[PDB]
Amino acid sequence: PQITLWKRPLVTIRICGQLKEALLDTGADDTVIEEMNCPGKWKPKMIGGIGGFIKVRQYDQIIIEIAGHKAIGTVLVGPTPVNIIGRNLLTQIGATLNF
Amino acid sequence: PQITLWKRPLVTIRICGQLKEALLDTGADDTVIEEMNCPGKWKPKMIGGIGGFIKVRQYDQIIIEIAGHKAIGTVLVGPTPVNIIGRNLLTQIGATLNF
Numbered sequence: 440p441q442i443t444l445w446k447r448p449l450v451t452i453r454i455c456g457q458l459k460e461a462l463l464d465t466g467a468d469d470t471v472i473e474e475m476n477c478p479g480k481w482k483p484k485m486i487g488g489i490g491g492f493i494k495v496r497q498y499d500q501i502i503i504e505i506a507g508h509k510a511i512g513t514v515l516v517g518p519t520p521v522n523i524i525g526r527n528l529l530t531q532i533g534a535t536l537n538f
Numbered sequence: 539p540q541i542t543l544w545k546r547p548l549v550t551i552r553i554c555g556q557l558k559e560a561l562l563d564t565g566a567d568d569t570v571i572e573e574m575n576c577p578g579k580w581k582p583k584m585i586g587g588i589g590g591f592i593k594v595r596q597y598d599q600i601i602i603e604i605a606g607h608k609a610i611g612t613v614l615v616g617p618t619p620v621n622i623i624g625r626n627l628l629t630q631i632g633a634t635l636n637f
C-alpha cells in the first residue's frame with residue numbers, strides 16, 4: 440500500500456498474540472512496544488530521544504505481524520507513549536520512503 | 539528518490555542559510571532542529587518525545603530545502619538529540635511510505 444503522511448502512519452500489528460496499533464517510524468532505529476507481559480528472555484537497554492531516555496527490555500527474534508506482513512527481529516518493550524515500528528522491521532516488510 | 543531503510547534516512551537540508559544533516563522521520567508530527575541562529579520572530583513552545591518534554595523556539599514560515607526539494611513551514615529549534623524532518627514538511631515535499 441501507499442501511505443500519505445497527512446496523518447500519523449498507524450497500522451495494526453500483532454505481537455505475542457495481541458493486536459495493537461503502531462506507528463511506522465523511519466526515524467526509529469529499533470522497534471519499541473508499550474509495556475506488556477511478553478514471555479521470553481531479555482536484556483536491559485536504555486534508548487534515547489527527545490526528552491531523554493527510557494529503560495526498556497530487549498527481546499530478540501520476536502515474531503510480529505505488521506499490516507498483514509510477517510516479520511521477526513528485535514523488539515524493545517517499555518514505557519513508550521506510542522508503539523513504534525522502527526527500521527529493523529520496516530525493512531522486513533519492504534517499506535520505502537518515496538518523494 | 540526511493541529511500542530504503544537499511545540505513546538511517548539522512549539528508550542534507552539548508553535552513554536559515556546553513557547546511558545541516560537531518561533525518562526523515564515519519565514518526566515525528568513536527569520538524570525539530572538543534573539549537574541554531576535563525577533570524578526573526580519566534581514563540582516559546584514545548585514538545586514531548588519518547589523521554590519526556592523539552593522547550594523549543596517555534597519559527598513559522600521558514601524556508602527550508604530538503605535534499606533539493608523546497609518546503610516553507612514551521613520549525614521547532616531546541617535541544618533535540620537528532621535533527622528530524624517531520625510530517626509537516628514531509629507532506630510538502632510529497633513523501634509517502636510504500637510497501
Ligand SMILES: CC(C)CN(C[C@@H](O)[C@H](Cc1ccccc1)NC(=O)O[C@H]1CO[C@H]2OCC[C@H]21)S(=O)(=O)c1ccc(N)cc1
Nearest residue numbers: 466467468469486487488489565566567568586587588620
Ligand atoms: C527522535 C528520533 C531520532 C527517534 N525517535 C523516533 C521518533 O520518530 C519519535 C517517535 C515518537 C512518537 C510519539 C511519541 C514519542 C515518540 N518522534 C518524535 O520524537 O517526534 C516528536 C516531534 O514531533 C512530535 O510528534 C511525535 C512526538 C514529537 S524515538 O522515539 O526517540 C526512538 C528512539 C530509539 C528507538 N529505538 C525508537 C524510537
